[PDB]
Amino acid sequence: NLDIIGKRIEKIKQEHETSWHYDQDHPYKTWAYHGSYETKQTASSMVNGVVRLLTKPWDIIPMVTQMAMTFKEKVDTRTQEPKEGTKKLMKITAEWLWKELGKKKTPRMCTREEFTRKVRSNAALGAIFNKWKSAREAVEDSGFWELVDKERNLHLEGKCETCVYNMMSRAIWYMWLGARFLEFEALGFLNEDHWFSRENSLSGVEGEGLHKLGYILRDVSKKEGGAMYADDTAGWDTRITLEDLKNEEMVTNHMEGEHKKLAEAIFKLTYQNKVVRVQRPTTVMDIISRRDQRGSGQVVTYGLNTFTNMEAQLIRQMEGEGVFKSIQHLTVTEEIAVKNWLVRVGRERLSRMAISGDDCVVKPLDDRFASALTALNDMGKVRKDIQQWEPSRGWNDWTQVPFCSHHFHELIMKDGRVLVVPCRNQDELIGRARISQGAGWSLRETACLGKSYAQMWSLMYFHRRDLRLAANAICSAVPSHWVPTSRTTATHEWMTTEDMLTVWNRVWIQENPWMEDKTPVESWEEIPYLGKREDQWCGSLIGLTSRATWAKNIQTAINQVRSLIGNEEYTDYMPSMKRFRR
Ligand SMILES: NC(c1ccccc1)c1ccccc1
Ligand SMILES: [Zn+2]
Ligand SMILES: [Zn+2]
Numbered sequence: 001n002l003d004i005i006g007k008r009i010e011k012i013k014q015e016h017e018t019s020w021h022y023d024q025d026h027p028y029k030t031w032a033y034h035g036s037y038e039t040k041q042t043a044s045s046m047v048n049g050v051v052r053l054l055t056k057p058w059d060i061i062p063m064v065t066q067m068a069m070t071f072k073e074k075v076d077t078r079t080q081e082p083k084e085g086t087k088k089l090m091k092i093t094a095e096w097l098w099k100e101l102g103k104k105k106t107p108r109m110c111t112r113e114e115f116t117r118k119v120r121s122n123a124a125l126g127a128i129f130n131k132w133k134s135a136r137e138a139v140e141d142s143g144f145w146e147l148v149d150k151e152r153n154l155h156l157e158g159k160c161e162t163c164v165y166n167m168m169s170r171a172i173w174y175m176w177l178g179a180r181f182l183e184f185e186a187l188g189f190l191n192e193d194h195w196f197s198r199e200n201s202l203s204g205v206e207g208e209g210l211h212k213l214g215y216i217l218r219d220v221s222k223k224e225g226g227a228m229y230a231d232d233t234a235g236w237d238t239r240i241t242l243e244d245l246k247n248e249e250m251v252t253n254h255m256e257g258e259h260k261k262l263a264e265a266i267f268k269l270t271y272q273n274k275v276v277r278v279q280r281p282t283t284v285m286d287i288i289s290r291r292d293q294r295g296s297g298q299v300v301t302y303g304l305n306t307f308t309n310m311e312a313q314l315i316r317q318m319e320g321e322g323v324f325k326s327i328q329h330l331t332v333t334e335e336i337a338v339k340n341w342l343v344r345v346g347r348e349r350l351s352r353m354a355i356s357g358d359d360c361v362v363k364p365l366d367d368r369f370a371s372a373l374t375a376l377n378d379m380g381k382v383r384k385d386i387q388q389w390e391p392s393r394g395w396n397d398w399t400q401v402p403f404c405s406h407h408f409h410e411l412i413m414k415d416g417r418v419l420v421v422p423c424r425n426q427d428e429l430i431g432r433a434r435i436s437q438g439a440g441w442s443l444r445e446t447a448c449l450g451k452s453y454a455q456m457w458s459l460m461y462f463h464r465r466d467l468r469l470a471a472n473a474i475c476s477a478v479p480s481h482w483v484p485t486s487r488t489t490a491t492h493e494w495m496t497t498e499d500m501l502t503v504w505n506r507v508w509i510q511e512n513p514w515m516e517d518k519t520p521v522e523s524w525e526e527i528p529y530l531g532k533r534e535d536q537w538c539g540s541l542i543g544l545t546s547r548a549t550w551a552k553n554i555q556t557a558i559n560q561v562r563s564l565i566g567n568e569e570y571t572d573y574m575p576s577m578k579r580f581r582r
Contacts, residue, residue, distance in 0.1 A: 001032075004273045005289050007161050009034050012277075012287055023284070030078040031276075031288035039285045044070070046436045050450035053561050054473045057546040058430050067431035074235045075171050079292065079380040085327040086378045087243055089318070089338060093311045094247035096342045100350075101195050101307075102254045109259050110188035112145065115181050124488045125184075126298055127177040128166060135177050148178045155182065155265035156258075163269060165276040165295050169235055173276070173295040183270070183297050186263040190251075190303035202350035203310045205404075206303075209491035210460050211507055214408030214420035215514045216354055217361060217398045223352055226367035227394020228401045232384040236305065236358030237294035239380040245272045245292065247311065248304045271296060305357035310350065312381050313362050314342075317349050319372035320364055327374050354403060361403050370394060411463055411528050417517055419508060419528070421463050426539030429461060430470075438487060445485060447565060450474050452484035455494035459507060463530050465542050472573040473554050475500070477561035479568035501576075524576040551579070 002009070013020055016037035026033045047068050058064040082090070118125065119135045132138040151162050163179040175183075190196070196204035198216065205216060221228065233239060249267040252260055274295050278286045294301055318324060323341045324334045354361040362369065371391040382388065395401045399408055405428075411419045433453035436446065454474035457467040484495055493507050494500075504527065505520045521527060529535065532542060541547035550557070554574060562570055574580035 005275050008164050008275045030076050031290050034287045036284040036286055040283050048434055048436045050447050051433045054557050055430055057541050057550045063427035064431040068435055074238050079239055079241050082378050083327050085329045088330045089315050090247050092338050093314055094250055098250050107255045108189050110184050115184055125180050126174045127180050128174050138177050148181055160269040167276050167278045186266045187300045191299045196303055196306045203353040203355040204306055205356050210422040220363045221398035223363050225363045225365050229362045229392050229394050230401050231392050233358055233381050234384040240294040241380055242292045244308050302357045306355055309355050309360055312379055313353055313360055315375045316372055317364050319375050320369035327378050356404050361401055413528055422460050423538055447478045448482050448485040451478045452486050458500045459494045462527055465535055466540050473558055475573045476558045480571040
């Protein structure tokens, strides 16, 4: 408790000595409260006018238009201690999983040099603005690195002064850039060196890309076994126990020297003991602590969520296969049985899963998995929108399974080759492309963000009639040589000024390991759509009068946007589609 968090608490006390007050009307039950201090401040979603002018039929669809308008009674909940049998299953499984993940990888420190390059090309490293403006400026000033040095030597000493979270089914924990550096130095190797790639982790999909995920689910479907299960956890980050944080820390057992000590300090000082500042309107700033739940950078959060989810799902598979009888307590021979299962079939069981942080698909040996709930519930990974003890409903067809907010279609090209394509309700795709985040967007920057959405649609969603047409329209309306942008950046092959047919060929044919015949496609007309009825089922306006008028008059919409942007060099992409090819 207060010996580890005191210094951080003591330090904040003094910067607001003219405001400190142990409030008695404090709303916290499960967060330990420490004091308050005076503040006053808040970014809402702005509309992308280039995308909206080229998607007029959607201006009257509430599921689209409502997306641009506008649980902290779940951050303040508590998760019970698992039973001794559960704690044992988790420790055995975690020990075994870090060893498998480490067989072909070497833990290593990430560098100031590497950190500097990331900030100078904009990755969402959730930092705060103070002493320097942007992260870009802090990183080119030795003063910063002297602050980093002081904290670093403090961590080697087993103490923390400045690693404090700022809080804002979502809650995002910003830290100052220096704390983010020290987290990246110690734990960045998990993401930088692809520990959760499918090749390395067998269940993982890190780096895979939306054009790969469907093929991966189809490969899992080919295994003998029961239904495919895709149970969502209710508020995964809030259900991470101190026991979970201690099994995650066992990655430090694979480290050495300075690195081992630096990583141990991140886990002890910042993860297993946390200090947070929260805005309360009654506007004060509350300084609260707790030992459990997930609060890390979003990139480390992803890798450790994947790890703990892989562990939880192997244990649920063990329960279904009868490897252990009860979570209350493991006998000695049950320990040897669990160990033996892991050594004997562990890698086969990992290959039966697709796991992306808190999101999973599992194809177990059989449907006993559906009612194997005791370990899952006792670890605190309670399923969303189903009663605690009601058996999971599985999916019989891999094309119906939800994963990473998508489902996947099998689409046969006129030439017989097979594409497995990502899909989601088209209102969600149009509604998201119509939104920009933050202020000070020029017309050119707004146009380049529209172009990023358009090129993503041409690569991932070409099979949706409305999206291939709208993508072609946006790419016709934005100057040909302007570079697609995004202020928050899976693999992003659409972020390029290369011709999109050449990128399509590279992604779907040349580099696609499931495509034996490498014959290039010569035009967009060779590239198929979903069935017309399947397109409607997934939200296509195809067959409406509004959509027919939009399609027929599309050059008029393109010319409206070209007139606003001004006298620039444009390309007409509409004749790449049969109906505008004269
Ligand atoms: N004629 C339309 C239709 C026919 C039958 C069912 C649904 C739409 C149609 C099809 C494909 C593209 C554009 C319009
Ligand atoms: Zn610190
Ligand atoms: Zn679909």
